[PDB]
Write a protein that binds this ligand. Sequence first.
Ligand SMILES: CC[C@H](C)C(=O)O[C@H]1C[C@@H](C)C=C2C=C[C@H](C)[C@H](CC[C@@H](O)C[C@@H](O)CC(=O)O)[C@H]21
Length: 425
Amino acid sequence: HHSSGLVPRGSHMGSIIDAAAAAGPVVLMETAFRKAVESRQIPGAVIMARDASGNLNYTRCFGARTVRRDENNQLPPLQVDTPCRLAAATKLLTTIMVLQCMERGLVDLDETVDRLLPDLSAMPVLEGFDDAGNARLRERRGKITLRHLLTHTSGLSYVFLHPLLREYMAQGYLQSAEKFGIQSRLAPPAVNDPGAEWIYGTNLDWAGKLVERATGLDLEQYLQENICAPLGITDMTFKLQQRPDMLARRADQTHRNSADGRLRYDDSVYFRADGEECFGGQGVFSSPGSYMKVLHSLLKRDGLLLQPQTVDLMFQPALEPRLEEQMNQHMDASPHINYGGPMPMVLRRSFGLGGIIALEDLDGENWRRKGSLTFGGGPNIVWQIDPKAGLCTLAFFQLEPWNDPVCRDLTRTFEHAIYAQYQQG
Ligand SMILES: CC[C@H](C)C(=O)O[C@H]1C[C@@H](C)C=C2C=C[C@H](C)[C@H](CC[C@@H](O)C[C@@H](O)CC(=O)O)[C@H]21
């Protein structure tokens, strides 16, 4: 029998193995993350999941915020409050800011940008190059609206992505459009007409300018007053170099070398200068914790950032069938870019306001449902909100390049486990 005055624990190997019930999906997944850190495959990660009710409030942190040893020769930890580079995860923030302007009657989603962005309206479309290497430019056909900006259907693209703009830079057209090693997201020309196709581009950088001009505030002040303050966030900024307290604790970016798969310190220009202006497509620094507050507020429809009906708009398929078709074709053909991150490489999608919408269940009742909204940031950051499942999740790394297979597999493992144990209905 038992020992007098002592809790009756396992007394032999039979009752000690049975004393521990078998490991569920989440515990097994945590082991995968720990092993990835231990085997040096990743520097670290933070994973977070929340429901609306409060019964799911899950945060786990693994590994280091850098590969550079600190003053004590140690590798400091990546924490839920570690300042990180959000890159394109900034786009959700800027989308919210635009939508607030709409709610306050400052802008209309279908008005042309000409009033507030005459500098964008006057910009030509790059069509090609002559034999001498001179750019061939033409007038835009049709007008860009704010809804085109929010849905990436304006005709704007990115210099690092579109072959026309790669050439444009090669020919030297953008050598004066940079300061502190950061290239202007406003200078490059469009590569198509608005409504012609879905093209990932500098749309939210322009939308951010629109917010600035509609409100008379710089995007930094607007951010602070309208997203940070209502959520009690004190560590979310475009101006990292003005926050000594965040600088002292920030993550470093890590890069995985293509040749050997080894992790190395990445001395990113974005961590040495903020730049002269706020680029709402890419420029915010914050912690995983503060980012989850944004996702969670949207999931709860608590009205702190936007009215519930405005949030609902963000989740509606915005593309007419022609564009929906072309986006899916482009994305299906481009697993090397993979905007959808952990999502299946072939999936019926649309675009909402703020990200990609799944138009079908990713794996029946095992994973994200139809109507879920998602996007990411360069350093393998992935976020999603799933209203049907009652969940939102974020996987935060500080590792480039985007679409790193190890991070993608871990992210899938994370979401799969959370859904398996905690999805409702
Ligand atoms: C500048 C940040 C950009 C917009 C970003 O985060 O985009 C993410 C988001 C993801 C959902 C979809 C993406 C689609 C295409 C790219 C592979 C891009 C990453 C490019 C990055 O590795 C190099 C640039 O940072 C070079 C520069 O800054 O000039 C990635």
